[PDB]
Structure 1
Amino acid sequence: SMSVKKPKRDDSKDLALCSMILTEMETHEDAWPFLLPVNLKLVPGYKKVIKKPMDFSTIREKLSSGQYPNLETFALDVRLVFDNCETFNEDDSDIGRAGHNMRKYFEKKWTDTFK
Structure 2
Amino acid sequence: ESTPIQQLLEHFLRQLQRKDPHGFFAFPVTDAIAPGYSMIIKHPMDFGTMKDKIVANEYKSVTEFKADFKLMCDNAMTYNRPDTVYYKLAKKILHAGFKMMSKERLLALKRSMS
Q: TM-score range by the shorter chain?
A: 0.7 to 0.9
The aligned residue for residue 95 of structure 1 is 86
Q: Which moved more, 1:47-56 or 1:32-41?
A: 32-41
CA RMSD of aligned residues (A): 1.8
Structure 2: 5+ residue runs without aligned partners?
108-114
Check if 1:113 corresponds to 2:113.
no
Residues 57/98 of structure 1: CA separation in 2 closer, same or farther (3 Å cut): same
The aligned residue for residue 4 of structure 1 is none
Offset at 1:29? Answer: 3.8
Structure-1-length-normalised TM-score: 0.80
The aligned residue for residue 38 of structure 1 is 29
CA contact (8 A) 1:30 1:102 kept: no
Structure 1: 5+ residue runs without aligned partners?
1-11
Structure-2-length-normalised TM-score: 0.80
More helix by share: 2
Offset at 1:21? Answer: 1.1
The structure number with the bigger radius of gyration is 1
Question: Share of identical aligned residues, percent?
Answer: 25
Q: Give 3-state SS (helix, strand or coil) of 1:33's partner.
A: coil
CA contact (8 A) 1:35 1:56 kept: yes
Check if 1:26 corresponds to 2:11.
no
CA contact (8 A) 1:30 1:98 kept: no
Letter matched to residue 35 of structure 2: P
